[PDB]
């Protein structure tokens, strides 16, 4: 035959026990049955976005025919899947393809209409082997489709339907559109209960029903491209795979320490100054201790919701995994941890620590982004440093953040360069700078330093960002900002803030500067911002702490240069008295440090004077501070 | 009134070339109403106006609200109302000379609502 | 390469797929330049590699491993959502400095065997 050589029976596969259990979807399978029992146009197409069970609708109809859960006219119908690549794959000569296809047609006509043809990927029916001698299989099925002779079940995607079928009008009326809806969440739960039984008996593991309902809710929550019930299933199967690797080999922390100790063993072999044997000793001791603890319980045999959280955190980036104790104990000290790079300004430090704790605890607003802040302070009191300290806490990295400074955006133009050009224009297929780089890594920090410089109607983009956290670039798609931490820094009233931070409380200062911002913004915008903090300048103690931190990073640079240098404690007082001005904050301190330390230091190092390893002190002169060699 | 004309002449409201001239507010949606020049993306699908008249040479063309358009679409309408032919991007020519090219506008709305009293129709 | 005749590419690719089904779940497939696999057999009225691999992918019965640049991913795979969901995104970040030093300490032996010279670890 030809049906033996170009089709695959689905009902055979359903009777041989190969196909999945297919749950729900009741109205669309009833409607596919309705379209298949006609006189002309026996041809349903299953339109839905890619991943919503269209192949599962067809294979479930096949299973219902096998179980006899169908009406009477469908009993005995062999549902056949056509392989169109099988038809194309041999017609090297002219006319061989059409012989193949018409032999298929004659055998289907001989089968008395008892075969429901299923063509997966109906966009691969146009362009099925046309050439100069074009018959295409579209212009051959078409008088057999229109006369209802052929019961072709289509299954095509939605953006492929417009491109490859609705650019051929005589074929698009042969088929009938069954708009498959993406399911709900509870329907996804039921679908995962049937497929729970399937993936349990495959991966030899067990899936608790909270792991299912957690996979459903969280994959609805935290994934922007893919759809239910695809991504839910993938989380379940990958959690099962991870548990199978845990059960087969050893737990993951054993593997972390094992690969790190073999790494450091290779590196200490490669050291043949070290500062490596301490780390190897720590890791080998801890690996032996945790191996003994694994022998004590001789870590899992099931799949829980925290497992789904581990996979979803390894899936997007967003920290949904439940708190290990190192992370949580690091997280409690967040107010303390910021004050190793931002000394002073306790207001927004405590505020932002509260914000990220509201995120990690789980009480965030799940429709609005985490951080919606408006920093306000005089020039050089660490606003940009507070945000870079946030990047350093949150990603172990200083310069890993989205810094889109409005200081280029001084016109209504540059809305385009944050959300991409609309179609037909120049950089259309490059997207926005912002929405691309939030579609890559959703969990991040948007930073808008010098936010008042922009033309005042750029912020309407941020009306969208703070209402819902969805932004629509030029390519029509939505990039979901509901994990981003939007921070804006300005100085709209810093004369007033340097003038009246004394003799007024924090509350009335926030009140008055918020009135100033209301003069500079609109009530639409400022009603979105969660907390608009006020920053004060930095007195002498903060200046001394900043001087200490900058001399720490100076010694930290000079350690690779190889010069461990001390300081006079009086020289700190000379830096304080030579860097003190309460109108510019902390940068005159830094450039006074720059001059009055580095210029004798770079003078004497470039002099051919200093040898590494020497005890070097920053002794003072009567006015100078010089480096001595001891 | 334009729907009444098409629903007299062809006995359907939408049996007419409706061209909504407030979609053409860019300079370059003349590509929509005339066609794509050759080799480009949708070349072998003509325009909307030029195709739909070369199908049916007797029909009523409603350019709806012409005054919202980008002003170098009036070049195309100059050629139409000059001689009833038009050169689409596929090289051919259209015979517009059996069509009714009705445009709408309201550009004196304050003025007409002001002085329809106490002024005759000529003034 | 060898196919200006109709169906000759699809012949090869189906024969490959039937061999991979024949190997009984023992062959891991690696496909470098997955964005080359997208526009693969694009002849006039021809399936690409997407339209032929796309059955065997989401039945699990092929063990492909893609390897693509992120800018090639946007233009060549995110433009086609069907093959875009068949895979699993694995972000491979640029390593930090210290781990890169470790990797280069691993690779010193290869260059010492190649150029017969030594390298200062500083």
């Amino acid at each position: 035959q030809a049906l033996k050589k170009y089709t695959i029976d689905l009902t055979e596969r359903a009777e041989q026990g190969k196909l999945d259990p297919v749950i729900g979807r009741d109205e669309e399978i009833r409607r596919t049955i309705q379209v298949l029992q006609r006189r002309t146009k026996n041809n349903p197409v299953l339109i839905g976005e890619p991943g919503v069970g269209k192949t599962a609708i067809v294979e479930g109809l096949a299973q219902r025919i096998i179980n006899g859960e169908v009406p009477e006219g469908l009993k005995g119908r062999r549902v056949l899947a056509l392989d169109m690549g099988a038809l194309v794959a041999g017609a090297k000569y002219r006319g061989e393809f059409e012989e193949r296809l018409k032999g298929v047609l004659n055998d289907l006509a001989k089968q008395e209409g008892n075969v429901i043809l299923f063509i997966d990927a109906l966009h691969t029916m146009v362009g099925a082997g046309k050439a100069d001698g074009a018959m295409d299989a579209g212009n051959m099925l078409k008088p057999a489709l229109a006369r209802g002779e052929l019961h072709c079940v289509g299954a095509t995607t939605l953006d492929e339907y417009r491109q490859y079928i609705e650019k051929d009008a005589a074929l698009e009326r042969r088929f009938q559109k069954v708009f498959v809806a993406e399911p709900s969440v509870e329907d996804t739960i039921a679908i995962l209960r049937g497929l729970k039984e399937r993936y349990e008996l495959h991966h030899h593991v067990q899936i608790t029903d909270p792991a299912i309902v957690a996979a459903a809710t969280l994959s609805h929550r935290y994934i922007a491209d893919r759809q239910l019930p695809d991504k839910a299933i993938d989380l379940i199967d990958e959690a099962a795979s991870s548990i199978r690797m845990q059960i087969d080999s050893k737990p993951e922390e054993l593997d972390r320490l094992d690969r790190r100790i073999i790494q450091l063993k290779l590196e200490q072999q490669a050291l043949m100054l070290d500062m490596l044997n301490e780390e190897l000793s720590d890791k080998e001791r801890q690996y032996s201790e945790l191996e003994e603890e694994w022998k004590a319980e001789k870590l899992r045999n099931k799949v829980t919701d925290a497992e789904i959280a581990e996979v979803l955190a390894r899936w997007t980036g967003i920290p949904v995994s439940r708190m290990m104790e190192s992370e949580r104990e690091k997280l409690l000290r967040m107010e303390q941890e910021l004050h190793h790079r931002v000394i002073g300004q306790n207001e927004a430090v405590d505020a932002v620590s509260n914000a990220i704790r509201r995120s990690r605890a789980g009480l965030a607003d799940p429709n609005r982004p985490i951080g919606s802040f408006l920093f306000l302070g005089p020039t050089g009191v660490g606003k940009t440093e507070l945000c870079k300290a946030l990047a350093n806490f949150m990603f172990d990295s200083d310069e890993a953040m989205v810094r889109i400074d409005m200081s280029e955006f001084m016109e209504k133009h540059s809305v385009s360069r944050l959300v991409g050009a609309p179609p037909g224009y120049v950089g259309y297929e490059e997207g926005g700078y912002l929405t691309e780089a939030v579609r890559r890594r959703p969990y991040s920090v948007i930073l808008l330093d010098a936010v008042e410089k922009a033309h005042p109607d750029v912020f309407n983009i941020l009306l969208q960002v703070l209402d819902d956290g969805r932004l629509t670039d030029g390519q029509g798609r939505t990039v979901d900002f509901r994990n981003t931490v939007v921070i804006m820094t300005s100085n709209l009233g810093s004369d007033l803030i340097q003038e009246r931070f004394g003799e007024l409380d924090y509350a009335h200062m926030k009140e008055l500067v918020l009135g100033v911002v209301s003069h500079n913004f609109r009530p639409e915008f400022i009603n979105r911002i969660d907390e608009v903090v006020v920053f004060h300048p930095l007195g002498e103690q903060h200046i001394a702490s900043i001087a200490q931190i900058q001399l720490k990073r100076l010694y930290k640079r000079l350690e690779e240069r190889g010069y461990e240098i001390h300081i006079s404690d009086e020289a700190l007082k000379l830096l304080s008295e030579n860097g003190y001005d309460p109108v510019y904050g902390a940068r005159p301190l830094k450039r006074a440090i720059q001059q009055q330390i580095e210029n004798p230091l770079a003078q004497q190092i470039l002099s051919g004077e200093l040898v590494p390893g020497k005890v070097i002190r920053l002794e003072v002169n009567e006015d100078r501070i010089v480096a001595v060699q001891h | 009134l334009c729907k009444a004309l098409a629903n007299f002449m062809f006995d359907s409201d939408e049996a007419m070339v409706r061209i909504d001239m407030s979609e053409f507010m860019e300079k370059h949606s003349v590509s929509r109403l005339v066609g794509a020049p050759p080799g480009y993306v949708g070349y072998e699908e003509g325009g909307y106006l030029t195709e739909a008249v070369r199908r049916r040479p007797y029909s009523v063309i409603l350019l709806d609200a012409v005054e919202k358009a980008h002003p170098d679409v009036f070049n195309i309408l100059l050629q139409v109302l000059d001689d009833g032919r038009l050169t689409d991007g596929q090289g051919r020519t259209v015979d517009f000379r059996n069509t009714v090219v009705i445009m709408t506008s309201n550009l004196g709305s304050d003025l007409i609502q002001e002085r329809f009293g106490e002024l005759d129709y000529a003034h | 390469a060898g196919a200006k005749y109709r169906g000759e590419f699809e012949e090869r690719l189906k024969g490959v797929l039937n061999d991979l089904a024949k190997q009984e779940g023992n062959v891991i497939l690696f496909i470098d330049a997955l964005h080359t696999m997208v526009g693969a057999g694009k002849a006039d009225g021809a399936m690409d590699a997407g339209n032929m691999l796309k059955p065997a992918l989401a039945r699990g019965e092929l063990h492909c491993v893609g390897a693509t640049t992120l800018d090639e991913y946007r233009q060549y795979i995110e433009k086609d959502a069907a093959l875009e969901r068949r895979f699993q995104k694995v972000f491979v970040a640029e390593p930090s400095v210290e781990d890169t030093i470790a990797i280069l300490r691993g690779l010193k032996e290869r260059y010492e065997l190649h150029h017969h010279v030594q390298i200062t670890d500083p």
Binding site: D132, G133, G424, Y425 | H28, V41 | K4, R6, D44
Partner: peptide, 24 residues
């Protein structure tokens, strides 16, 4: 006894790109 082989017949297309302009 030769059989005329059906071809592959690779094709081509293009795409323009507009450019708006501010009008100060």
């Amino acid at each position: 006894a030769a059989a005329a082989a059906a071809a592959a017949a690779a094709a081509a297309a293009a795409a323009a790109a507009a450019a708006a302009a501010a009008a100060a």
